[PDB]
Amino acid sequence: MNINPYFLFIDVPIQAAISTTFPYTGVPPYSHGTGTGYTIDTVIRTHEYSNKGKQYISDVTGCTMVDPTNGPLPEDNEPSAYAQLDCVLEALDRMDEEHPGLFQAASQNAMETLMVTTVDKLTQGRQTFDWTVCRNQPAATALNTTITSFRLNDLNGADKGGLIPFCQDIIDSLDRPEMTFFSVKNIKKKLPAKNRKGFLIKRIPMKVKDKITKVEYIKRALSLNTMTKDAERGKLKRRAIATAGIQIRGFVLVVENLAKNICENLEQSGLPVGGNEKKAKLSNAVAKMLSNCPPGGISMTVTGDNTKWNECLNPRIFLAMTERITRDSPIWFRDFCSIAPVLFSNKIARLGKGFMITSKTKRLKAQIPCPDLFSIPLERYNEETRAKLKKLKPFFNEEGTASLSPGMMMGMFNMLSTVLGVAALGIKNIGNKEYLWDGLQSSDDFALFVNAKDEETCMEGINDFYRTCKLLGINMSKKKSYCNETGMFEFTSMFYRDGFVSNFAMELPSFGVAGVNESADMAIGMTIIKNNMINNGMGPATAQTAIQLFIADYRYTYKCHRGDSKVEGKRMKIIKELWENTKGRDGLLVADGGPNIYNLRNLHIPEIVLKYNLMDPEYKGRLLHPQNPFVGHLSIEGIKEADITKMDYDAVSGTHSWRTK
């Protein structure tokens, strides 16, 4: 009897058992080597979809630029970047004239948040390309080194405190004829020795003061670090992600805030919604669209994906968008909200590490860096890399970075592209034909419902939506999109069938020891299970199994198994002695060898408070000792605040609140 797992779908609907088509128990794929090849491929693909546009040379940096906007129309189903300007202006005008007062309200909210926030908002994010040392850094140290190097060239806006003088310093540093900065350099200092040579060439760290020119500061300011996307599930081949510097974060923050203020009052946007509100969003959208169908007419639904989505959107189209949106606003905010498209239309990709050339017979290897990429003849690379380099060559600058005008290259404007998608969805009709479309748009994903008299008119409306999105640079994947009747679709990997919503493609996290200390990890783990059960919709028996898996990992990591168990060790000897000496055994903590009591209803309670009225008086005297020698000096981070990589747990400072060296 040959067991077949797919036969499960004969007696169960496929949406109810779709979680077996998520292989989330295996290893997510990592990327050993360089992401120089993938970055070169992304540069070539970006410049390939827009090669029929206007090509020129920048008179600021000297890079070869390419402009595809208001270019020729496509003639094939290949991807395009040629977004017509009047079509985007008409989509935004219809979006404004259907929701009156929306744009002025969003612009006023964005300015009245700009006149409030401070520069510490530029630390609550991700890694940051550092122009000082040409590497990724955290956001706090990148902002700190940028401020302390701006102080040398008399740029004292950040000493005031706000965001507007700091961005004034950013756009005024581009006019300095020379920029000086603090670069950490291990420049050698010679030391004597007693050996045959008598010198030890070592690398003593210090801080030197180096300076570059104005063009080099501009090219480091417009730069864009690139790497490979690690641990990304769902694709076979890897890809490159970008990371922008600190000269651009303050403008991207305001443009994202403006587009979020637009998207919050949009009735066809599935971002930034979250929780069970998303299942309500799918059900409300299907109910509103079935509450509008003609009698005797068919309502279809296209479940769709966007191919090359962040490679075909232009920053000039985003410049035109933020020029249209902030229209009845003052001039300085109209110039402020038009600087992030300027810095994204002149961006320069950094090419990564290089390529490793080997010699197999002599068994040697070396790494060709990015400047010397064209310093060897091209017949010493393999065929894929050789075609890559032949196609890259007109865009390579001699510092090892390649020019990249079009495309969004990872997605920093994840809300303005959503606004563009909703602007495309709001057209609803072309040429007074008998259909109407609506639907949802989540950054890269989308779902389009079409009501019409029959299904031929539905397919004609779908074709008009495809040809209309060609005019905006919105490319719809014809290999990853299908279309069926209403009542069976998918959006952001939430599946919908017959009113039932299956919420998945959330991998269950590592239910294991975070590593802070004993009481901290117990509180963090139980809060992880409670937050998963509230937000992600984790079931009851699944959460009890998650409690048990966390308890097993917790007892392994801290060597604190139950006192009536046969586990042995250096700690379990004294733990079993404590279990022998204790009268009331249910008051002992988990980490002292006692039992577990956590169930679904008391995950919010600390362990010490949960077990306090059951402890022996001796055990709570030694446990809650005032001058216990394990805690040390107090601070807020050792009490409540710690990250999950943020939460706030409740740790009573007893003798399980130690810290390492």
Partner: protein, 86 residues
């Protein structure tokens, strides 16, 4: 990785940072063949290190402290427990 770091730290003999006082003098240097803490001096702060078996030694045979009025401090979670128990 902090999970593996906490795993390999608890495998090690002396991963903790025992502060000074008389209470760190109450804890012995070994106990029934288990070396609880070491006995050394540091470069800048002059300290020692100890095992987690020493923490369980404190919880089993340590000195009784004063807890006449602990429940007045953390009464938020005790109100949570009072709501839970009935």
């Amino acid at each position: 990785n902090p999970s593996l770091r906490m795993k390999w730290a608890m495998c090690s003999n002396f991963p903790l940072a025992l502060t000074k006082g008389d209470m760190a003098n109450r804890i012995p240097l070994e106990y029934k063949g288990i070396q609880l803490k070491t006995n050394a001096e540091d470069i800048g702060t002059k300290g020692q290190m100890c095992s987690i078996a020493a923490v369980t030694w404190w919880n089993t045979y340590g000195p009784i402290g004063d807890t006449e009025g602990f429940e007045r401090v953390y009464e938020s979670f005790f109100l949570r427990k009072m709501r839970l128990d009935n």
